[PDB]
Amino acid sequence: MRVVIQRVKGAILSVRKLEIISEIKNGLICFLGIHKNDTWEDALYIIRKCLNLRLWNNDNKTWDKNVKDLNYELLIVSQFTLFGNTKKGNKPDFHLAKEPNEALIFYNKIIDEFKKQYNDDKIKIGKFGNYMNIDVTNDGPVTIYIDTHDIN
Amino acid sequence: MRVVIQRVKGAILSVRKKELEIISEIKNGLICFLGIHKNDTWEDALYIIRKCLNLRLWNNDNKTWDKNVKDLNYELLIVSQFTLFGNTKKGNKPDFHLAKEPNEALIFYNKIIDEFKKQYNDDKIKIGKFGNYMNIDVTNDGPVTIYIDTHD
Ligand SMILES: O=S([O-])[O-]
Ligand SMILES: O=S([O-])[O-]
């Protein structure tokens, strides 16, 4: 599983009819790529790190507060392009990306877990598989990358 | 070297002077968050630049993943992003020991920006304020997020 996490002052997600369907203020936008061979342990890890990474400064301290500490939100967005392989040519290929039907179930299960580990009202999502327009106010910016197939 | 590339309809980069003032802007094109590693060689940088300029990330009324940023005469906003080397494996406070030290990194980055201009066009390459806090409003188009680590 891969995730690109970006610290934001807000984000506004839109889909084509453009129309708004999701919005957050301060918090994280998480581009989430699900792998062909991802287990639930892979998803737990991502969820844990999104909720607990200390990406905000506080008072005298830096990298001190996490998204929950500040009661901030998460916009969780499915992003298979993160498995776009560009090693062998300029046309990205996504053979590693878990197939769209199983991926959607996995993603939904992941969104449930996010809400369970945090707060139902604090977890926003995008339209899985659909073209989306997302206006993001990057705060910093702060971009973090995690590939669960780097730990075991 | 690591880069997170995101397809955008535009991006507006600001720095603090309530102070936030604009210093960079693109319309359609790529925003590239660039992390420079302690052990990066110019070959590492060449690779990134090549992939940013040549990845076919736009559809072409006929073919998906068909056109690259140059083909469309689109722009690139190149942003330094050491947080990409933020290690989160061992705890929730990211540590950036792998990130090339700030002074050598700045030279490398500047050299990289020269090469971008370059291999493309002087007017097509926008940058951020290295080492400074930035506010970046990004209109993510898709979105399309690509990740590349040259040490792969
Ligand atoms: O937005 S500025 O780089 O023309
Ligand atoms: O001037 S900025 O780094 O707050």
Specify the CATH number for the domain of residue A78: 3.50.80.10
Which candidate, B93, B51, B22, B63, places its Cα nearest to that of A64? B93
Residue with tokens 């997170």: B4
The dihedral formed by the CA atoms of B22, B82, B49 and B115, expressed in degrees to the nearest 10: 70
Identify the three-state secondary structure at position B135: strand
Q: For ligand 1, is residue B141 a contact (CB within 6 Å)?
A: no
For this PDB entry, the determination method is X-ray
Specify the length of chain B in residues.
Answer: 152
Contacts 24+ apart (CB under 8 A), B41-46: B42/B111, B44/B1, B44/B150, B44/B151, B45/B1, B45/B108, B45/B111, B45/B112, B45/B115, B46/B115
Full residue range of the structural domain in which residue B123 is found: 1-152
Sequence-distant (≥ 6) Cβ neighbours of residue A74 within 8 angstroms = A24, A27, A28, A29, A30, A50, A51, A67, A114, A118, A122, A123, A124
Identify the three-state secondary structure at position B31: strand
Which candidate, B127, B135, B138, B123, places its Cα nearest to that of B21? B135
Q: Which chain B residue has the Cα nearest residue A49? A: B92
Q: Within 10 A of A152 (CB to CB), how many other CB atoms are there?
A: 5
- What's the distance, CA B79 to chain centroid? 5
**Structural tokens at position B6:** 């995101």
- Backbone dihedral region of A129: left (phi > 0), alpha (psi from -120 to 50 degrees) or beta? left
Sequence-distant (≥ 6) Cβ neighbours of residue B6 within 8 angstroms = B30, B31, B32, B33, B138, B140, B143, B144, B145, B146
Whether cis (ω within 30° of 0) applies to the bond prior to A141 is yes
Q: Kindly list the residues of chain B whose beta carbon comes within 8 Å of any beta carbon in chain A.
A: 2, 4, 9, 33, 51, 54-57, 65-66, 68, 79, 81, 83-84, 86, 88-89, 92-94, 133-148, 152
Residue with tokens 């702060």: A142
In chain B, the largest separation of any two C-alpha atoms, in whole Å, equals 47
- What's the distance, CA A89 to chain centroid? 27
Identify the three-state secondary structure at position A120: helix
Sequence-distant (≥ 6) Cβ neighbours of residue A100 within 8 angstroms = A129
Residue of A53, A91, A137 with shortest CB distance to B94: A53
What number of CA atoms fall less than 13 Å from residue A7's CA on the CB side?
A: 22
Query: B146 contacts in A (CB within 8 Å)?
Result: 81-82, 84, 86, 92
Task: Give me the helices (H) in chain A, please.
Answer: 40-52, 100-117
Nearest CA owner, ligand 2 atom 2: B133
Amino acid in position B39? N
Q: For ligand 1, is residue B24 a contact (CB within 6 Å)?
A: yes
Which candidate, A5, A10, A4, places its Cα nearest to that of A139? A10
Sequence-distant (≥ 6) Cβ neighbours of residue B40 within 8 angstroms = B1, B100, B108, B150
DSSP label at residue A99: P
The answer on whether B65 is annotated among ligand-binding residues is yes
Distance, in Å, from the CA atom of B59 to the CA atom of B63, rounded to the nearest integer, reads: 6
Distance, in Å, from the CA atom of A65 to the CA atom of B151, rounded to the nearest integer, reads: 31
Instruction: Please give the helix or strand (H or E) that residue B21 lies within, else none.
Output: strand B21-26
In chain A the beta strands, taken as DSSP E runs, fall at 2-15, 19-24, 27-33, 54-58, 61-66, 73-78, 123-125, 132-147
Instruction: Please give the helix or strand (H or E) that residue B43 lies within, else none.
Output: helix B42-54
Mind telling me how many Å the CA of A139 is from chain B's nearest CA?
A: 6
Distance, in Å, from the CA atom of A132 to the CA atom of A128, rounded to the nearest integer, reads: 9
Catalytic residues of A: 81
Distance, in Å, from the CA atom of A36 to the CA atom of B46, rounded to the nearest integer, reads: 31
Distance, in Å, from the CA atom of B144 to the CA atom of B56, rounded to the nearest integer, reads: 11
User: What sign for the dihedral angle of Cα A142, B141, B64, B127?
Assistant: negative
Q: Total domain count for chain A?
A: 1
Q: Which residues are A125's β-sheet partners?
A: A76
The values of phi and psi at residue B48, to 5°, are -55, -55
Please indicate whether, in this complex, the C-beta atoms of B142 and A84 are within 8 angstroms of each other.
no
Pocket of ligand 2 (CB under 6 A): B 16, 132-133
